[PDB]
């Protein structure tokens, strides 16, 4: 009861900062998005294709077994 | 106030044998030389 | 439609299959359309002492309208390992892309 009153009362003061709309314009002015994670993909359709990064490839172990 | 000693017998032995007179002893020398230079 | 993806195993034949799905499927059906095949081997070995690691991957989607065919292959060749030398390995990769009737050219 006291906590949910004091948190909202502090939010009223902290949210009421000056200007408050130029930063909306600053954030929305960069309509190019944040840069997204790179994957190897095909040129025509963009399905992922397998990678040979050393820090992942150094953990891999395979073996050979006879067939039936 | 103000030296490398070598062995007579081993030097004679290793000078006595020859590689390079044919491909067989040459290839034996190549294989040994690769592994010996490694380890 | 869950009774269509419950099937008997076959256990093992060498290759692996996965189904490939699109982002917007049809409304009253399952969205998967294509099949990706994967194969992996080590051909020129004598008694389990192998030669030429090799693998291959093909995605195929075929219907009466379009055709998608992607493929990738890798071949690894080992020249020396220690103590016979240093570790010296070359690798050859090939890939191809066919997408009909959108593009009418193929990519190598
Ligand atoms: Mg596909």
TrEMBL record, chain A:
What is the protein name stated in its UniProt record? Uncharacterized protein
Which organism does this record belong to?
Answer: Chlamydomonas reinhardtii
Residues included from the entire protein: 26 to 93 of 98
From TrEMBL, chain C:
The entry's localization annotation reads:
Plastid, Chloroplast outer membrane
Tell me which domain of life the UniProt entry assigns to the organism this sequence originates from. Answer: Eukaryota
**Which annotated residues bind Mg(2+)?**
61
The protein's name is: AIG1-type G domain-containing protein
Give the organism, scientific name.
Chlamydomonas reinhardtii
**Shown stretch of the complete protein:** 646 to 753 of 967
């Amino acid at each position: 009861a006291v906590k949910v009153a004091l948190g909202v009362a502090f939010a009223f003061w902290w949210t009421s900062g000056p200007g408050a709309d130029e930063e909306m314009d600053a954030k929305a002015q960069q309509e190019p998005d944040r840069r997204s994670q790179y994957t190897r993909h095909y040129a025509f359709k963009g399905r992922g294709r397998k990678e040979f990064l050393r820090s992942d490839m150094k953990n891999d172990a395979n073996e050979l077994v006879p067939t039936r | 106030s103000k030296q490398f000693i070598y062995s007579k017998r081993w030097k004679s032995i290793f000078s006595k044998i020859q590689p390079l007179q044919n491909g067989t002893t040459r290839k034996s020398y190549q294989l040994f030389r690769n592994v010996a230079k490694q380890i | 439609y869950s009774h269509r993806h419950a099937y008997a195993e076959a256990a093992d034949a060498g290759v692996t299959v996965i189904p490939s799905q699109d982002y917007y499927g049809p409304e009253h059906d399952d969205p998967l359309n294509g099949i990706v095949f994967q194969y992996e081997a080590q051909p020129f070995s004598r008694h389990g002492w192998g030669g030429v690691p090799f693998d291959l991957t093909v995605c195929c989607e075929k219907d009466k309208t379009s055709l998608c065919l992607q493929g990738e292959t890798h071949v690894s060749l080992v020249h020396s390992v220690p103590p016979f030398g240093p570790r010296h390995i070359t690798q050859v990769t090939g890939s191809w892309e066919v997408l009909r009737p959108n593009i009418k050219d193929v990519m190598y």
